[PDB]
Amino acid sequence: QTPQATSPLAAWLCYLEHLHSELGLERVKQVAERLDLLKPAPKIFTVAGTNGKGTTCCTLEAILLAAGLRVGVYSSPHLLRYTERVRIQGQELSEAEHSHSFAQIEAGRGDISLTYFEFGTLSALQLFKQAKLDVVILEVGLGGRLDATNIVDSDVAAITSIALDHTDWLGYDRESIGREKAGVFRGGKPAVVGEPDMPQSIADVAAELGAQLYRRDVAWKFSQNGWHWQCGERQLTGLPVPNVPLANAATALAVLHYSELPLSDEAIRQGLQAASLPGRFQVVSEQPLLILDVAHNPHAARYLVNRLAQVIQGKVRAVVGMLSDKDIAGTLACLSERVDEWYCAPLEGPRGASAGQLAEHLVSARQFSDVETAWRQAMQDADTQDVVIVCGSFHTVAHVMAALHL
Ligand SMILES: Nc1ncnc2c1ncn2[C@@H]1O[C@H](COP(=O)(O)OP(=O)(O)NP(=O)(O)O)[C@@H](O)[C@H]1O
Ligand SMILES: N[C@@H](CCC(=O)O)C(=O)O
Ligand SMILES: [Mn+2]
Incomplete structure (x- = not known):
């Protein structure tokens, strides 16, 4: 109809x-x-x-x-x-x-x-x-x-x-x-x-x-x-x-x-x-600093790395999901200049990358069932002086936004 x-x-x-x-x-x-x-x-x-x-x-x-x-x-x-x-x-x-x-x-x-x-x-x-x-x-x-x-x-x-x-x-x-x-x-x-x-x-x-x-x-x-x-x-x-x-x-x-x-x-x-x-370098919480950024290519990732360097002794934890047609390899290499710990998740449907498709670009990354689970683990592990950055796609940032009912 x-x-x-x-x-x-x-x-x-x-x-x-x-x-x-x-x-x-x-x-x-x-x-x-x-x-x-x-x-x-x-x-x-x-x-x-x-x-x-x-x-x-x-x-x-x-x-x-x-x-x-x-x-x-x-x-x-x-x-x-x-x-x-x-x-x-x-x-x-x-x-x-x-x-x-x-x-x-x-x-x-x-x-x-x-x-x-x-x-x-x-x-x-x-x-x-x-x-x-x-x-x-x-x-x-x-x-x-x-x-x-x-x-x-x-x-x-x-x-x-x-x-x-x-x-x-x-x-x-x-x-x-x-x-x-x-x-x-x-x-x-x-x-x-x-x-x-x-x-x-x-x-x-x-x-x-x-x-x-x-x-x-x-x-x-x-x-x-x-x-x-x-x-x-x-x-x-x-x-x-x-x-x-x-x-x-x-x-x-x-x-x-x-x-x-x-x-x-x-x-x-x-x-x-x-x-x-x-979702454009949006600070949602502190101690730990929780930042949401919809960066999904190396150019945006370079901007995001430059901002992160201005806000962090504490670790950067990245919660990431991307679509399968992006320049995954390049975006994650750029982010890896400042990300210390990786929390990878799949995105749903035929267009999303699996957590494995992200992990294969990284060294012993964590892999999770879905973004919210990855994000809750990151928050749970984070010390006070850490920065948790949610990035890689709109879907990643939005799954976190829906989970915080912003
Ligand atoms: N001039 C810039 N140089 C470098 N990175 C930028 C620039 N403008 C935006 N970004 C980054 O790109 C991302 C999205 O910015 P945005 O203004 O939403 O662009 P958009 O072209 O509408 N793409 P989208 O976010 O997918 O809707 C964020 O990570 C921004 O920080
Ligand atoms: N994807 C862009 C062009 C830039 C690109 O392909 O990298 C578009 O919105 O048309
Ligand atoms: Mn846009």
């Missing part, structure tokens, strides 16, 4: 998780066109990148909300609830609102077939259209050029970082990754690049499209009390350090600058003081 407007959101998600799968955007665009969904707000920012999309978007959101605007954010993936994926004034909507919205997409599509993410994306656009917003922030699902979020013409587009989230493959490198991401840029519009080691293909695509390229360390830059953000001969000085990676706050300032939106000193500082997301 196809669910209805009044069915539980869980029924819609089961229907969408079975959507039988086809490359372009012509289908999703045609549905959007029918439901008049291509202009959710008069200002649209679209954010691509390997790591840093979510926290870049949340910094934009925090600043724009501090400035008194009505703001929507579309985000993915989610930790515990699908309702995390759409925020309006910083807050989630009801499950009922999502079920009604999906029903409208289902009726609106006719016999045009859509993927899970295309359906989610159209529903989000519809929820935003309805909410009378000034700005909509769209986090790219994957890539950008052919991502469902790319049906909307953005006012400013951004790439937060370039890194490899998957294993070696022919033709799969920073250049190929970059090229696909740069497909969110638009002719005549600012294209903000927050990656300091930018592949050439990003510049090639920006040139083909006629986008205006504004790169970190060329057009704008930042440093380090507080921190400083500069673009040409102008700067912001003594900014508060936010609880997101500074590169991504810097990318968000660049977006906001090139958008030409009017923003007070107060809005910028209050936003930076509020900006954070659950």
